[PDB]
Amino acid sequence: WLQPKRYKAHLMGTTYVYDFPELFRQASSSQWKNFSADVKLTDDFFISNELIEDENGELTEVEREPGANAIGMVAFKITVKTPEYPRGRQFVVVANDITFKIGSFGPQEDEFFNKVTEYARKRGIPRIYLAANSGARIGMAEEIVPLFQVAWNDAANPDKGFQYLYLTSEGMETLKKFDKENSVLTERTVINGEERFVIKTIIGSEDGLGVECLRGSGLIAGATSRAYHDIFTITLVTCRSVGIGAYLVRLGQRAIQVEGQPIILTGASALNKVLGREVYTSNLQLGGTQIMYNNGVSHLTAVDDLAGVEKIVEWMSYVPAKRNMPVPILETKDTWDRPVDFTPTNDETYDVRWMIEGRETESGFEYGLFDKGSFFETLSGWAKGVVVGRARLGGIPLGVIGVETRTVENLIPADPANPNSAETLIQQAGQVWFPNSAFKTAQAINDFNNGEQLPMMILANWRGFSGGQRDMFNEVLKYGSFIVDALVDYKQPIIIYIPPTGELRGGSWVVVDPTINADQMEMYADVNARAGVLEPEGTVEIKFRREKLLDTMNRLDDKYRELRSQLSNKSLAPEVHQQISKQLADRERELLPIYGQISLQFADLHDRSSRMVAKGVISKELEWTEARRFFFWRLRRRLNEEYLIKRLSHQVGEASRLEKIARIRSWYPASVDHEDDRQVATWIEENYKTLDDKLKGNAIDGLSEVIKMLSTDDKEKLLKTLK
Amino acid sequence: LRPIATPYPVKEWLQPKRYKAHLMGTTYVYDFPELFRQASSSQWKNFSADVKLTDDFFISNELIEDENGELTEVEREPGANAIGMVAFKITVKTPEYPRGRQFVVVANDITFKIGSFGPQEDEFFNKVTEYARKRGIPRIYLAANSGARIGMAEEIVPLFQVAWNDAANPDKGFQYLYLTSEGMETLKKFDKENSVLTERTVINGEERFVIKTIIGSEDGLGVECLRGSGLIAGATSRAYHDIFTITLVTCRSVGIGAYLVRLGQRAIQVEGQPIILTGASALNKVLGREVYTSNLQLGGTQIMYNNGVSHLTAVDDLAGVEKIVEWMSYVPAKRNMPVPILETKDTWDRPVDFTPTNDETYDVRWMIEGRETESGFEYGLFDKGSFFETLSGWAKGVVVGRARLGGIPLGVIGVETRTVENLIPADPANPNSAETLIQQAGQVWFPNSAFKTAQAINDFNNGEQLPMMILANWRGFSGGQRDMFNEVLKYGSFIVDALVDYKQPIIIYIPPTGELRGGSWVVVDPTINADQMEMYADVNARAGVLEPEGTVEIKFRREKLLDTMNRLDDKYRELRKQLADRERELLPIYGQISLQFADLHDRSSRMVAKGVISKELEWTEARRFFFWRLRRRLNEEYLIKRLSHQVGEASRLEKIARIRSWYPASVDHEDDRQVATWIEENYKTLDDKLKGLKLESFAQDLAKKIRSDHDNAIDGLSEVTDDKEKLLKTLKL
């Protein structure tokens, strides 16, 4: 029954739509096996029910035989009991049916997709889209093809040309007969004693020919744009994804691309016709993984459909069950109560990931800041200068942004359409934001914020932005501002931590300071961190110049001081004066290097975490080895306090964030140190139910209008009040 | 005096700071309002040369913080600024606001500590920004700075000692820096104990106070300045959404200063004044070679104007001030006020003269503003001389600017049909790099033109609060390898996002010779923002999934073409050898027939029939049509906004249905002129009737609250001077 349609899809290198929930069931089971191999699953752990529009065109869960779809767009509401949600979590799966009219988007497919998107959106549940299509549906008025006539310039010579296309009374009568007179817009003329119905416009009786499909593209593009802000959106490019299909992948932002499946706008063949040469060899050349994964359009790659489904399910494990719910806490064997083992040094080169997830070493595993094996890196193929991913801190999921200290290189391919173009390698220095790494940073902030609704840790380590001509021309200023904007829009706790060996300077600090979003942001610097406007060399150039360098010499070098003192003798011969002056300038020459080194140390001494603390720009200075223990309780307390704020907001609401926490903090016992993270979180957790109870406890003219209608006895009272 | 014998006082001698500013190639802060007064007067002269102005037309009042740090107006001598950041609240009677309009001017003082940003400057800038934001008035920033303020603990400089490896040889090195008991006592004496963090050590029976951290007693040395940068960056980011923001790069703008230029989005750069993050000299020290020759090489107009970071260029400070004043003339006096209607000699009631042809090359601008021609001026869609193009140096494939349609200001996006070229400079740091010319075909969205489109939509929406017309004419996006690799997909999606966020009427008009296809229609369909968007297609426009040639390739292949030859050719039909020879003969003409057939589907009439466009239009009548449509839309929009005051929350489809019902029987809802006229003729009547309803419901509510819980409410009624006086009069009658 489904055997033919199944092969038809496999032939196209994709899974048949109705076979996808099975892959989700497999991925969900694997998820369990990796979490606790000793957990035995029942069929009630995973449930998939198709979504079909009812009598009133409203989407509803159903139990129906697969492949009975009257349209090329299908949907499922999945309910899974997962390690993070053992009682269950739900999401929606929208997918094109590649077997139904080549996976094209017609008005019906567009309306359904939109309805499904709104369904997920209304319920706050994630929307998963499986892209396997050929873009907007193309058509012509087939009923007109055997009917249309040609008004020849000379009927004896067709090469002399034609004036217009028309219908005869016969052709017009054939359309009337079949109830199709609205298929064309004609204009009656008489030529050679015959009614000629000049075709002014061809409309077609059949729907889904052109513009109507395009209106649908627009509708679904705007709907996706909207959904990205509202719920968790992800796309699996399971087969080719063309035109509107390509836009849907980017519009849902988060994308996993199956190796060998292209994300294209226009096919290689068409591009060759427009170019008038065989320029492009394939669609993969235009939109394969080597294009999209390198761009950052595709966040991850997959070997097959199951691999992709597994990566969706893994990504979702960091995402709340639905909008506004708390982030899914999933504690594992690597608990919070341990020091951080891997510590960077300025003398040995390191991979940030060792600091994040830890490092396998000959003498055993060196634990990092986050939970062993909790780091799920995304956008791994693009702007490799920044390291972005999801991690867990003692069970708490969060977004992580780290800085790649190593020089990063990337190949820009040769433009097939330009024979006077060659491939290009670009090298970018570590600890510097470039247009790409700045864009990725802003992108990461946004993706963690929207739908994922995650807290975030930026392990801040940037010298600044690349200020040179190339990068300035490639709009580094634009991409850096995105970071500020992304930070302003943030809605969950943010932690900015300058790690050991880390730094932040004038250009990099501007975009990460907590004052950007005081509601969510906090900054911390490691004891082995550095921050100042400029790097020591730059600061001495401005603030410890020659005059200062010569004063320090007079104070410190005996030889310099003595020679300067010899120049106080008002009895000197000019020649002798020139001699002492010469010896002094020769001592300055001799001392300039080391006194320059002294100045660098003096500048560096201002750039410390202790000055940052003293100046009130950071919350606390920290020791890397204790950062895990510290941050775990800080994040935990922040999330609890954030919950109570959200609760207080949904009752009163008419107060500032500052006013809302001050009230909440006033409910804590007097002996509770508000600066003690572990104590606060513990008290809150021990008292959620108790707190919930605590929580559960122009006009002057209208005022004149009613006051007048009141009784005499009442008016007498309010008269006394006015008096 | 320098010079002596001048007829009038030497302004540069009376205030030496003025000469310092000039010596840096910028205008003295305190002389900027004078330039605003000149620009405002020129504005009047160009509008109506026969208008006599009095000095009361322009007023500038310096804003300084009071005892409580609240911004207050002052009249004081220039150069009295105790901080390097100065502000003015300007009040001008302008052609668009003849009774007056107000804005705020924030500027760095380049003479005060080299225009650096210290915590005080940052706090003032933020306060000023909040001042403008609270009042809904525009915020103009004049950038002339050296970024964040750099400092060291000057009190430590004459005190610090060096622990030498060998005191006899300084080149052998040093261990650390320290203080003596004497230096420690010196700090205590001056109440500066907190300047350093020391650690007491005894080296050879001598007390050494090892310097562990230098803090400094003086504020504005490092990180505190950086916290200020962050605060002002976020404040600007916020203001861009709230009020009209613009920046004039009047002298160099460094670090945080460069970020402020971009963060306020709209920027005018004075030729020869750089927008830089790091100076060329420093970059040369970091690189270890003389790579860069100047700061202009990094952030001059040839970099920023070409980038789209700088929206416009200026020859001098006045030119820049003139361009600010011109740009503001399309912006409401303050947030949420109606767009400033400024009717000129070119009224709405006229046909459009310049019409493009399918066979001949044209500049979109001729369609927009009109064209000077040998036989006289050919009027365009908008008001003669009303087109103010911005971002003119970047992504020249799209034409963006402000215009007026019969006095109504709006944002305009047009498509450059000509091939556009741009020079990508050679990277000075890479000797294996050369300059590159890139050519981009007309009527196609590329990463740059897509970015500019989205940028334009955003800039018209935020602060400017303008309606917008997109003269939609795109084949699609460049889907080829280079552009796909250069993330065209990302930049195109920005357009969708930008459209979603739009808050004023949008008109999508496919003009004559215009087109929209599968790839380009996706990002401009009205369903993206049904609340604001409408689409129209000219009678000579085209729209379909693919271009005719693409559609025949899929839907009118050989078999169909030969069946067509069989029907429409006696010779071919009779033959059903010689048949293949007739196919050969007919192929070129039947290809034209198949293409015409295909094209016949791509018409405005099919768009109308399919319900994808509001109306199909004739270009020559588009001005007359759009004027009244926009006018009618703005009047309805205002009444929807006015209804967002009425007792109870309602959808916009509810609000429009309500407003529309009120229209008298004689008012044709399809007549844009009648509907706009009715709204305007009855605004006072509507406002009155509406007020009487917010009151009537308030009156009903209080009687409800009172006719149950009497005594308890009468006490609260009692609980709730000038107001008491009114209520007393009411009770007395």
Ligand SMILES: CC(C)(C)n1cc2c(n1)C(=O)CC1(CCN(C(=O)c3ccc4n[nH]cc4c3)CC1)O2
């Ligand atoms: C070249 C590359 C490594 C990409 N890079 C590396 C950068 C940048 N570019 C930049 O465009 C920014 C930056 C920030 C940090 N820097 C300073 O603080 C600085 C200032 C003044 C100085 N004078 N002498 C030495 C100095 C150092 C150097 C420039 O780092």
Ligand SMILES: CC(C)(C)n1cc2c(n1)C(=O)CC1(CCN(C(=O)c3ccc4n[nH]cc4c3)CC1)O2
């Ligand atoms: C000029 C250039 C930049 C190369 N360009 C010009 C473009 C693109 N690129 C594109 O990547 C997209 C596009 C869109 C409009 N097009 C069609 O609708 C179309 C489809 C199929 C076809 N088959 N034969 C001829 C055909 C035409 C052509 C390709 O325009």
